[PDB]
Design a protein around this ligand. Structure first.
Ligand SMILES: *Cc1cc2c(nc3c(=O)[nH]c(=O)nc-3n2C[C@H](O)[C@H](O)[C@H](O)COP(=O)(O)OP(=O)(O)OC[C@H]2O[C@@H](n3cnc4c(N)ncnc43)[C@H](O)[C@@H]2O)c(*)c1C
Ligand SMILES: *[C@@H]1O[C@H](CO)[C@@H](O)[C@H](O)[C@H]1NC(C)=O
Ligand SMILES: *[C@@H]1O[C@H](CO)[C@@H](O)[C@H](O)[C@H]1NC(C)=O
Ligand SMILES: *[C@@H]1O[C@H](CO)[C@@H](O)[C@H](O)[C@H]1NC(C)=O
Ligand SMILES: *[C@@H]1O[C@H](CO)[C@@H](O)[C@H](O)[C@H]1NC(C)=O
Ligand SMILES: *[C@@H]1O[C@H](CO)[C@@H](O)[C@H](O)[C@H]1NC(C)=O
Ligand SMILES: *[C@@H]1O[C@H](CO)[C@@H](O)[C@H](O)[C@H]1NC(C)=O
Length: 502
């Protein structure tokens, strides 16, 4: 009796006769494993590999895997788009199998009722595309990156351009299909409201394997206006603009998103701020708005085109500059090694301190580090904190991402340490009790939950409280109820409650 072969037998038993199981012996193993590992940082020979990969195409397949891993004693890591910031969807410390959902990417739109059934392995890109094909004036609220998978994205909250208008993708989910620790398939009805609440932004990896979402589509203007302007002046003049942006961006009506980037340019060199818009409306209203609200930014008509939504979608994603069918292409953009961390901001950062933050970009190579800033007003002020597990709503001015991408496996420690040091540095200026963070940018630095350690609950709280709010209690309530033996677990997952505290 050994687990790989015992698994495979059990699986065959539950399901006789495409390929659904891969082992190291299969020619395709490696390139499947590899295909969707998004962060090159976790591609080494040292990196643990699973005993089996399964690629289900049917709820029945998922039930079997869950059942068989339960029996033989393997751990599951589900991979949907593979974008985990920490590789947590494809690495484990213990013998494990990855459940790659790439074969379950069906997307079924009901144009009239304005809903859609999207399977767990589809990618934003696809969702965007196929919605737009059915109707140019429709879409869905979600991240910017087309290759993000909907399993990780939605169950983690997930948001982007439409955030200020409609909220997080998790805010717009009507139903789902989920398989639990007992291998049952559950709709919302049968799931019950606690579990339906939980999977919407509490991390699906804590409760089960989601198989499908039901999605409610949102209205989207047939023309939006985009400018995106370069600003490489002297460092102080730059922050003078930043400070202004900081106090107003979140204040616009719902129809303006104004975001900002920072990086270094000129290879051997100066800090550059880019300021970008999605404006639901025309060129002139927009210039007028800008000319009124933010003169010093000095945008002009010459500065901005008006695009269709899907074009805007494209403009604002990881692909150079063409045609809209890239949205469909699993292997677009370039994969890099990356480290990212994100802060939320409630109170304007002091101009002095900000130069210092910007000053730090000089300490890595040109283009390596980058700060992304997105504003936080509009609808987020009216959505309750416990509406869903994701609790970051009212009184946030904007969010700050600090990110580094590189190529080379040696330069790892160097680069992740930079990201940390900027994080450490900004600590006085960002949110505070507690320092809020975002489940979809997992940060093991916030604390780890170990395989080889007894499960202290008050330990998990430290980070549980950062990712979620007051929401954390209800979350551990749901865990304890639906997966009391903590079968669905990872290096930073919600623990159940031990039974003497039941
Ligand atoms: C790589 C990348 C990520 C981005 C980018 N832009 C984002 C943005 O603009 N807004 C955001 O809110 N998030 C952005 N993200 C990050 C993604 O939101 C997160 O990285 C998601 O968690 C990624 O989801 P996914 O693409 O599926 O990657 P996986 O590694 O497979 O991570 C999934 C995560 O959750 C578990 N899981 C996935 N699917 C399921 C199902 N069906 N059931 C249970 N659990 C599931 C996995 O185990 C893993 O833990 C821009 C870029 C470039
Ligand atoms: C795994 O990924 C790395 C970089 O993408 C690459 O060197 C290697 O060829 C990949 N594995 C394959 C093709 O089996
Ligand atoms: C899921 O379960 C079985 C196994 O193949 C099949 O009868 C059913 O139609 C499947 N549904 C799909 C592939 O949509
Ligand atoms: C979408 O919106 C515009 C703005 O009113 C309208 O003129 C256009 O005809 C619409 N088309 C569809 C297919 O909904
Ligand atoms: C911006 O405002 C000034 C008036 O102070 C004006 O001269 C300029 O033409 C305005 N912009 C547009 C687009 O008209
Ligand atoms: C960041 O802060 C933590 C906690 O105080 C510390 O352990 C770590 O070394 C710091 N990282 C730096 C200074 O880069
Ligand atoms: C959880 O609580 C205990 C008991 O008071 C504490 O001492 C310990 O540090 C925590 N447990 C673990 C495993 O870290």
């Amino acid at each position: 009796a050994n687990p790989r072969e015992n698994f495979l037998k059990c699986f065959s038993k539950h399901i006789p006769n495409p390929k659904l199981v891969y082992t190291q012996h299969d020619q395709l193993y490696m390139s499947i494993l590899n295909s969707t590992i998004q962060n090159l940082r976790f591609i080494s020979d040292t990196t643990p590999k699973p005993l089996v990969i399964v690629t289900p195409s049917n709820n029945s397949h998922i039930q079997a895997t869950i059942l068989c891993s339960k029996k033989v004693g393997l751990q599951i890591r589900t991979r949907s788009g593979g974008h985990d910031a920490e590789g947590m969807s494809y690495i484990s410390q213990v013998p494990f199998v990855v459940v790659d959902l790439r074969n379950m990417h069906s997307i079924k739109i009901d144009v009239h009722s304005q809903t859609a059934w999207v399977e767990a392995g589809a990618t934003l890109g696809e969702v965007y595309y196929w919605i737009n094909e059915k109707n140019e004036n429709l879409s869905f609220p979600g991240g910017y990156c087309p290759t993000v998978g909907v399993g990780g994205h939605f169950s983690g909250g997930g948001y982007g351009a439409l955030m200020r208008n409609y909220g997080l993708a998790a805010d717009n989910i009507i139903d789902a299909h989920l398989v639990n620790v007992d291998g049952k398939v559950l709709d919302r009805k049968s799931m019950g409201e606690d579990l339906f609440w939980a999977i919407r932004g509490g991390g699906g990896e804590n409760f089960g394997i989601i198989a499908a979402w039901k999605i409610k589509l949102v209205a989207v203007p047939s023309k939006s206006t985009i400018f995106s302007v370069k600003k490489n002046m002297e460092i102080h003049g730059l922050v003078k603009l930043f400070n202004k942006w900081q106090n107003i961006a979140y204040k616009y009506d719902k129809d303006l998103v104004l975001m900002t980037h920072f990086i270094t340019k000129n290879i051997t060199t100066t800090v550059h701020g880019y300021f970008s818009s999605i404006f639901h409306g025309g060129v002139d209203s927009l210039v007028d708005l800008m000319n009124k609200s933010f003169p010093e930014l000095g945008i002009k008509k010459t500065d901005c085109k008006e695009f269709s939504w899907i074009d805007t979608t494209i403009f604002y994603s990881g692909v150079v500059n063409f045609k809209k069918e890239i949205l469909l292409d699993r292997s677009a953009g370039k994969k890099t090694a990356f480290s990212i961390k994100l802060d939320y901001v409630k109170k304007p950062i002091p101009e002095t301190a900000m130069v210092k933050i910007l000053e730090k970009l000089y300490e890595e190579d040109v283009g390596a580090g980058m700060y992304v800033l997105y504003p936080y007003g509009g609808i987020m002020e009216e959505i309750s904190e416990s509406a869903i597990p994701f609790p970051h709503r009212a009184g946030i001015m904007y969010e700050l991402w600090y990110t580094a991408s590189w190529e080379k496996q040696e330069d790892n420690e160097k680069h992740i340490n930079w990201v940390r040091s900027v994080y450490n540095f900004t600590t006085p200026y960002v949110s505070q009790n507690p320092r809020l963070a975002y489940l979809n940018y997992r940060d093991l630095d916030l604390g780890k939950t170990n395989h080889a350690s007894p499960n202290n609950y008050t330990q998990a709280r430290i980070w549980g409280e950062k990712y979620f709010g007051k929401n954390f209690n209800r979350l551990v309530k749901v865990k304890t109820k639906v997966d009391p033996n903590n079968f669905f677990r990872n290096e930073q997952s919600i623990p159940p409650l031990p039974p003497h505290h039941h």
